[PDB]
A paper describes a structure:
To calibrate the observed SDS-induced compaction of Bet v 1 with previously reported structural data, we determined the crystal structure of the Bet v 1 with SDS. Consistent with previous reports, we find two SDS molecules bound to Bet v 1, which retains a conserved structure as compared with complexes with other ligands or the apo structure of Bet v 1 (8). The inner SDS binding site is harbored by the prominent hydrophobic pocket and the outer SDS binding site is located near entrance ε1, delimitated by the C-terminal helix α3, as well as the loops connecting helix α2 with strand β2 and strands β3-β4. The outer SDS is extended and oriented approximately parallel to helix α3. The inner SDS molecule is similarly extended and oriented approximately perpendicular to the β-sheet, with its sulfate group pointing toward the cavity entrance ε3. Both SDS molecules are defined by a diffuse electron density, reflecting the inherent flexibility of the alkane chain and at the same time indicating a preferred binding mode for both SDS molecules. The inner sulfate interacts with the hydroxyl group of Tyr-81 and the carboxylate of Asp-69, whereas the sulfate of the outer SDS is exposed to the solvent. The crystal structure, therefore, allows us to unambiguously assign the inner SDS with a high-affinity binding site (Kd = 7 μM) and the outer SDS with a lower-affinity binding site (Kd = 100 μM). Ser-136 is located in a segment of helix α3 (between 129 and 132) that is known to adapt its conformation upon ligand binding to Bet v 1.0101 (8). These data are therefore in excellent agreement with the crystallographic mapping of the inner SDS binding site that partially overlaps with the binding site of ANS, DXC, naringenin, kinetin, and other ligands to Bet v 1.0101. Taken together, our data suggest that ligand binding to Bet v 1.0101 is accompanied by a defined rigidification of the protein backbone along with a compaction of the 3D structure.
Author numbering: 1 to 159
The structure:
């Protein structure tokens, strides 16, 4: 079955610039701006388009060693990014896949709004724990703020 989780957050970065950096160049930025959140990002196969497999390794002492994500869909026009956690970390005999959908909307003040949907695909009927989702939300938030700060301090990047 599927557990559906949802949340929203704001950014001081315009939608397109944030999408280009935070979403489309997370491979480069995450290990650079938040090394104590993500140690490395490895392209296993593909470009960045649908089907691309990436291996995200976490620092020593983290609850998980790594996860492998698969790019599902990339919409440059509507700033939509869909990806799935397909292996590692929480994935195993209790959890088959986590399908994520991200959308970034412009706001008139020059910022943006992020809408993220998480779907936990469980096999035999595990329960998904509140502290698992809450941890994942904290990770995403840490990544966003660290990228945000970088983009404020590096005006020439991702224009
Ligand atoms: C293994 C996947 C689950 C990880 C949960 C981590 C939540 C907190 C992430 C910030 C840690 C570091 O934050 S930082 O302020 O030093 O950059
Ligand atoms: C409200 C806190 C949540 C903010 C959203 C954070 C989502 C992380 C984006 C990773 C995109 C890159 O993922 S990738 O493995 O496919 O390259």
């Amino acid at each position: 079955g599927v557990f559906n989780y949802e949340t929203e957050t704001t950014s001081v970065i315009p939608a397109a610039r944030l999408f280009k950096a935070f979403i489309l160049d997370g491979d480069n930025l995450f290990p650079k701006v938040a090394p104590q959140a993500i140690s490395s990002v490895e392209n296993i196969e593909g470009n960045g388009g649908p089907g691309t497999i990436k291996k995200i390794s976490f620092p020593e002492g983290f609850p998980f060693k790594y996860v492998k994500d698969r790019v599902d869909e990339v919409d440059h026009t509507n700033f939509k990014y869909n990806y799935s956690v397909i292996e590692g970390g929480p994935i195993g005999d209790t959890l088959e896949k986590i399908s994520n959908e991200i959308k970034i909307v412009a706001t008139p003040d020059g910022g943006s709004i992020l809408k993220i949907s998480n779907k936990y695909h469980t096999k035999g009927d595990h329960e998904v724990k509140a502290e698992q989702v809450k941890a994942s939300k904290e990770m995403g938030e840490t990544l966003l703020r660290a990228v945000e700060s970088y983009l404020l301090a590096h005006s020439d990047a991702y224009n």
